[PDB]
Amino acid sequence: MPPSEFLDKLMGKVSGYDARIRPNFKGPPVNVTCNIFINSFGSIAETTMDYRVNIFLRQQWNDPRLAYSEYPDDSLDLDPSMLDSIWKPDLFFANEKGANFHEVTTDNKLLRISKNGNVLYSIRITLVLACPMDLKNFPMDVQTCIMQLESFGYTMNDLIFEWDEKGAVQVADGLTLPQFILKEEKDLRYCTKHYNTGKFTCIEARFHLERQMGYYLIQMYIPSLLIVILSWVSFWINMDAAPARVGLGITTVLTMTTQSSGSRASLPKVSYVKAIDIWMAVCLLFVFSALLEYAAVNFIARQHKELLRTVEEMRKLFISRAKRIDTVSRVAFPLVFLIFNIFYWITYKIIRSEDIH
Amino acid sequence: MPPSEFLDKLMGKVSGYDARIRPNFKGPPVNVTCNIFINSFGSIAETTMDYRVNIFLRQQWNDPRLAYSEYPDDSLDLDPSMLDSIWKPDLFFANEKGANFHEVTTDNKLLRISKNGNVLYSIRITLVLACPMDLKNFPMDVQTCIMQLESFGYTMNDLIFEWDEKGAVQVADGLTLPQFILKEEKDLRYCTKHYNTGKFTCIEARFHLERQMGYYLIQMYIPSLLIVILSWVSFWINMDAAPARVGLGITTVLTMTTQSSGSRASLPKVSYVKAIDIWMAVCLLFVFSALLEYAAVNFIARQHKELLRTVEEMRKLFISRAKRIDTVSRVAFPLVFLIFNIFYWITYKIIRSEDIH
Amino acid sequence: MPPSEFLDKLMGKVSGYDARIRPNFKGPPVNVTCNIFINSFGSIAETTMDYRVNIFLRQQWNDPRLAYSEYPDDSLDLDPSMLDSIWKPDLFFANEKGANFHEVTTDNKLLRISKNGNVLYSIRITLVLACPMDLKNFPMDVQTCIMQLESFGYTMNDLIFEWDEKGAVQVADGLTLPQFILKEEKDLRYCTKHYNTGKFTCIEARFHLERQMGYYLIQMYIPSLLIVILSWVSFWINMDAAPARVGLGITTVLTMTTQSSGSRASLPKVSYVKAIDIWMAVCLLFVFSALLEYAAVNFIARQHKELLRTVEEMRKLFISRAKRIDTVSRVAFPLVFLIFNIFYWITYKIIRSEDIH
Amino acid sequence: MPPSEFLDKLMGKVSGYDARIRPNFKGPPVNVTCNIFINSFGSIAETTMDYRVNIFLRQQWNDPRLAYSEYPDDSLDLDPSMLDSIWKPDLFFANEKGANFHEVTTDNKLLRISKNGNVLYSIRITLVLACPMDLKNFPMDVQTCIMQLESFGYTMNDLIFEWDEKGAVQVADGLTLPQFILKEEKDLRYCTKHYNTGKFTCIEARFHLERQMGYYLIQMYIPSLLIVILSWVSFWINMDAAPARVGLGITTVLTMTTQSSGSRASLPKVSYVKAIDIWMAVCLLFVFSALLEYAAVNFIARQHKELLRTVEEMRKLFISRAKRIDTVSRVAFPLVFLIFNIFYWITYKIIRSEDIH
Amino acid sequence: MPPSEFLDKLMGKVSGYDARIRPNFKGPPVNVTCNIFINSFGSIAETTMDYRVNIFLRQQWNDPRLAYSEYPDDSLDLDPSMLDSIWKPDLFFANEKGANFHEVTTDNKLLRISKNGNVLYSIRITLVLACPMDLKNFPMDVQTCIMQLESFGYTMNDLIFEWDEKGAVQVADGLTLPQFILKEEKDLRYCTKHYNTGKFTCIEARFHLERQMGYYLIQMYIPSLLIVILSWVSFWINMDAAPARVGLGITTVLTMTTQSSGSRASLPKVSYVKAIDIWMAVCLLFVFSALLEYAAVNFIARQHKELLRTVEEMRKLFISRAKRIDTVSRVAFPLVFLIFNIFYWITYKIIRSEDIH
Ligand SMILES: *[C@@H]1O[C@H](CO)[C@@H](O)[C@H](O)[C@H]1NC(C)=O
Ligand SMILES: *[C@@H]1O[C@H](CO)[C@@H](O)[C@H](O)[C@H]1NC(C)=O
Ligand SMILES: *[C@@H]1O[C@H](CO)[C@@H](O)[C@H](O)[C@H]1NC(C)=O
Ligand SMILES: *[C@@H]1O[C@H](CO)[C@@H](O)[C@H](O)[C@H]1NC(C)=O
Ligand SMILES: *[C@@H]1O[C@H](CO)[C@@H](O)[C@H](O)[C@H]1NC(C)=O
């Protein structure tokens, strides 16, 4: 048998196959199973609020026509340039940006057809998809990003979309993300869409992402704690009558606030307060208090000098006050810092532990 | 009855349907009702002066032709690939940038046809639209952004555009903006367009936006007020003969002006003065006055030392002057700041309250 | 009469109308009048050297064919999808970047035809056009930007382009630019183009733009004058034996030069010197002179101390010298600044006044 | 013989050549040899994780049809506009971004055909290809970048891809990269792909790149070592009772940490620690220790002054302690730096030497 | 005679003109002369390594067919929409980026045909072309940029490309570049290309560019020399026992190195050292030496004070040493700077003078 005669007899002009009519017309809705393969997950960002993904869409449906049963083989791998003479279903994504097809040398398309009429359609597409992430806890967080597949032009009475029981979502081997860790859970549920025109089918897929804490610690947690260390026992040791001691303190306050301004650069503008903001505010409070304490001891020493110019006994009293304040501080401040850090770290670890459940 | 015979008999070559002629030719103008659904409002910006929106346009009109009345059903959901054989009306937006169609797998289009001849056309399009915002009050403001739909090629005698009485503008459930809050008012009015060629129909839709005050306070209001706090009682306490006191003051003036330069980065260049500029200018005036007062007390002390090298009585007079000036300042400055902030905040709250009405 | 018969009889296959031949072949050149409407002027920039404009091109010409005279009406508004079966003239812009057409829902096109044969063609196009601006005077300047319309493929013997006597250039009502003020002059002249292939017709339109002085004053003129004020009477008052006085002066010199570097950011690199550069250089000269004068008084005081360790009479002489220098400076410097500013401002106002004529 | 008759008789409508059927149908798989020529390697970057390449793909296969043997010549150079009437194989790249064809004036295509049936297909294409580089050692590293060629729609039973034994990968003469040095090794191996649909052929090509150390030394290694030099013997020489000495040290710590923040700008965010981070951390440790030592000597001197206000013998003891500490440091610090640099440089040279093997 | 009959009789279906066969088939190669007109040279940059140019390509060749000799005129200006029915030659550029055609209203194309068969083809195209510039001497340099035209699909036996003897390269009148000066030399030579497939013709055009020295002097040469001036006689005059003198020097070193980092921003990363780097390194060496000298005099003064607490004679010796060192320096440093600048400037002027030849 010649191949040409079968290919034009099956789906051509001599056949009564109209490509504008759905299979099982005036009948039960056409069921469609959808299988997705993830080739390369990438380009997650915060300011734009979207990520990039390159998928391999695969959808199967049945046709009562296109049942040959004359060749002795089971399936046929047809050419992909005659995909315009069959009934492809419509499918779009609600959060759709970009989405251009890949057509290098030959169109990246695939067609298969079985003896009973089961078809197999495979398309390669790169999707820019919008994820509305919530940055309540900025350094430690889990983000859920949504993919939606739905029918633009048909109602529920036609083209019901179903998931696949086995291997619904697959990932390419050895795929890694520099910033996030993907979780192997991939919970699947479907939510219908209601409009004034009608009610339309939809299916949804969810991915869970965990941010890596490694980078953030080195850029922000360690240098801020260094600036704090540079104030803990660097000027308290120094002599009370020093211009430089106040200079040291002012410069430390200045550069740490400049770092605090530096931290909020990539982040999109939001009303609510992030965890990193809390940490920077507390560190700024300690370094500002350092100058405060200096002002206090300088004012007490000024009274001592003013009366100095019974007086010796009062002079002794005033210097003794100075010594008590400085030593008391030199041991008072470390513990409050310690109590803070332990409280902050334990509360953030337990809130992620509760949220993940 | 076969479907193919009806579809080509109705709108094909055997039918006298010319797709280049308007319905009701040499007759009353074709009325068109327009319904819009907002899928995703996003990407509002100031420098470029425009925003991004993804809509679901829907327009209905009547045709005296395309009245079948032979099938027993009421409406028909046709294929969307034969939308080139009917009379679509022309429609464009005056503030048009971008506006490319979404064609993933299948064109996102919809066609319906009733027994009398009422059609239903639905198109998905992403629009970049120019909004000429007025930044008279930068942190607290309400912005009105305009959408215009008008006919490029037909005059008033044809294609009059009407709004829909019920559900003219709809919004997707759970839609939020990070920076702005959308108001559920959506006032609709239509303004005709006059040209030398002729007079053309148009309809307009208005959206009201409220900016969130939360982010701006933390980035700018609180640190500037911190710098001010760092000058209020940090160097006044310190001893009069100090090089560091003037160093402290100079550095505070320097970094606050650098912050003032930093604030105007995203903003487009404008001639008029914003509210945030007023606040930064007043804060700069206070910190500059701090140095002023230092220069004054230093000059008085220099006269005291110069004569010091009746003289004691004049020496006492000069130091007494020094003490009066410093203490007087230490209580004089807080109130003026307080009177300022209360005046500024109450006037901006009442101007927004008057403007919103 | 049916519409279909007239539309295909007039400009179809039964008609001997070849769309590849110009009207009045082997005859006098086809005259063309061009009318332009400006919808939205925007995006003027300096670094890229170009601006963006959205126009409504309109061109009219006569045809000896396409003269019907059988319907009783005067003109006909035809469909815009059959603009490929007539003789459109070629037209391009010499400074052409971008220039893509707007095709939302339906192509933005317009066709009209009169009884004698006068046609009317209207096209909406967004143009990126290159303007070679001269920044000899940067804050105060007038810029002339050029639009050129010319024929690529025909010589002078065909397609002569003419302007329209009345309403040649129109602007949309209530159109404003944030940075520039447009002038209602719009002088029109035409310059022919000569090439080795032949001589080709062209027409030119000129727009005059005035930059707003409001923004530039607040960002640059006022803070630099503030830094200068911060040196005029802040350290001269202070005691001669002060480390801080020189610190004050050095910091002021440093930050003003950093501001001078900051000013030249948007500007494209150019060999010649702008006015703003002159102002910044003069301010830098004053603040550098401030330190100079300090070095002088410190050296004189050092000689006084060195001999101090007849001597009293010489000691008195040296301190008297110190006082003369400082007081003389305290009144000498203001006038030279005043003479400068009055000279600079009057010369720039009179040069713009002479240039505008 | 006329050329037209041969060209349409060979591959036209009178010929039974169907372009939708593979050669040797129901037969052994079609073998394909692939030869690549690299025109211009460029645009390697780290943040985006991809590079740009412009290649000349060349693939040869045999056909049992298209064997003429009637003209007396061996090969024919056909027109490249009739490449749609033959059986091109499908080919795509797994890491595919961009990949648009070059079509200036005429499509950049090439066709040749021999007497036996061997064809020659040449295509010019610019590829954006993703390379997942590992930055374990940032300044000194070797990066391997992967190119993959595979069949989208055919299984192993058809279209097996083979490399070419001679001249598989060629490079244009005099091709250089500003940042990297290409290695003339180009190891070639092939890895098959397994999917649920089937098993598909693939071939892989690897390129080795060496980063140049010249630029990194001048921007980062030399200035940091300068800051370190500016602390080694600049303040140790200075008098113990100096405010400036601590000022010097604080400023050096501040600017070096600002440089450390500056270094990580181009780099993508990663959890693991790079070599440059180790070097900057160690330098920061030395400059922080400098202030530490100052605090120590100041505290010892304060005890000396406090008791100073047997006492002389204890006063001598305390100053002697001061001298021992300072001189000991002045010779103690250089060696540890020397031991460090020699250890760091030798370990990085030997790890690259081991890795390259 | 009707025009339609001649246009379809000459190059249509009744004519035996096959557009897929080269003229003079099985004959001597088709000679082609190429003339280029430069409309607008622009956008030269360093980081990307490429420039932008808008040209008017013009190529002439002869055909033995298309010789009419029946109309009485010499040449014909045909329509440019029938350029698909003739034998255009293939032509591409080796360093090809972008290269999209300009199609505003009508395609920018031109066709002419003479009586003997000489055709004239004109195309407007904007080219992004890669220039591999060598930055050995960054502020003063001459750059040569290459344009290559070559045949993709034909060997030497066909389509030999020749230049035009008169007016090969033309430039539009009044064309200027902001940064570079174009030289009116334009040397033309041709280099053949050898490949494994065959040997292919090519022709090359070279442009010489001179960078303007005006901008670079004001941004970098003058302020660095200012910082140097701010160290020459500002602190040497000041008293030896001053904390501020060392503060002055440290700040000058700091800001100049920050400027040195600032200078290398636009520049692409390169291993070799530019001239500007040499100048900045030498200036940094002088300002670092300034602090060095301070450390020296402070150490000598410390010995003087230590012994001070025969001794007077040694005290005199030590102060005399101090005076000798300072005065000697005050006259020693200017000359070495002078010798440097004269050496550097004369060597760079003579190397450009030798290179240009
Ligand atoms: C699709 O599945 C539903 C539920 O199993 C079924 O009722 C319906 O008949 C199916 N459609 C077919 C078989 O066309
Ligand atoms: C459209 O509406 C107007 C106003 O109601 C009416 O006058 C006109 O006849 C309508 N057009 C029709 C029915 O075609
Ligand atoms: C166009 O105008 C010129 C000048 O008025 C005239 O000489 C020429 O005949 C006109 N062309 C026509 C009428 O076709
Ligand atoms: C391709 O090569 C394989 C291995 O050499 C061989 O078995 C097969 O027959 C070849 N295919 C042909 C000749 O079509
Ligand atoms: C092209 O020029 C060469 C050299 O002048 C000549 O040999 C060849 O015959 C020419 N080709 C023609 C005339 O077709």
Numbering used by the authors:
A (entry chain D), B (entry chain E), C (entry chain A), D (entry chain C), E (entry chain B): 32 to 340, 395 to 442
Can I see the authors' text?
Glycinergic neurotransmission across motor and sensory neurons in the brainstem and spinal cord is mediated by glycine receptors (GlyR) where, in addition to pain perception, they play a key role in respiration, motor coordination, and muscle tone. GlyRs share a conserved architecture as other members of pLGIC, with each subunit consisting of an extracellular domain (ECD)- a twisted β-sheet of ten strands, a transmembrane domain (TMD)- a four α-helical bundle, and an intracellular domain (ICD)- a primarily unstructured region between the third and fourth TM helices. Binding of glycine in the ECD triggers a conformational change across the three domains, leading to channel opening and then eventually desensitization, involving distinct gates within the TMD. Here we investigate the molecular details of THC-GlyR interactions, and probe the conformational rearrangements underlying allosteric potentiation by THC, using single particle cryo-electron microscopy (Cryo-EM) analysis of zebrafish homomeric GlyRα1 (referred to as GlyR) reconstituted in lipid-nanodiscs.
In the GlyR-0.1gly-THC reconstruction, a lipid-like density is observed in an inter-subunit groove wedged between M3 and M4, and in close proximity to Ser320 (position Ser324 in human GlyRα1, previously shown to be critical for human GlyRα1 and GlyRα3 potentiation by cannabinoids). We modeled the density as THC, oriented such that the methyl groups of the C10 monoterpene moiety face the hydrophobic groove lined by the Phe418 and Val421 sidechains on M4 and Phe317 on M3. The opposite side of the monoterpene ring has the aromatic hydroxyl group that is oriented toward Ser320 (corresponding to Ser324 in human GlyRα1). This orientation is conducive to forming a hydrogen bond interaction between the aromatic hydroxyl group and Ser320 sidechain. The n-pentyl tail points downward and engages in a hydrophobic interaction with Ile410 and Val328 on M4 and M3, respectively. An alignment of GlyR-0.1gly and GlyR-0.1gly-THC structures reveals local structural changes in the mid-region of M4 and M3 helices involving residues Phe418, Ser320, and Phe317, and the intracellular ends of M1 and M2. The outward orientation of the M1-M2 linker moves Pro-2′ away from the pore axis, leading to the widening of the pore at the location of the desensitization gate. Interestingly, at Pro-2′, the pore is less constricted in the GlyR-0.1gly-THC when gauged from the pore radii and the Cα position. The GlyR-0.1gly-THC is selective for anions with no Na+ ions permeating through the Pro-2′ selectivity filter region. By counting the number of permeation events under these conditions of membrane potential and ionic concentration, we estimate a single-channel conductance (corrected to 150 mM NaCl) of 23 ± 1 pS for the GlyR-0.1gly-THC state.
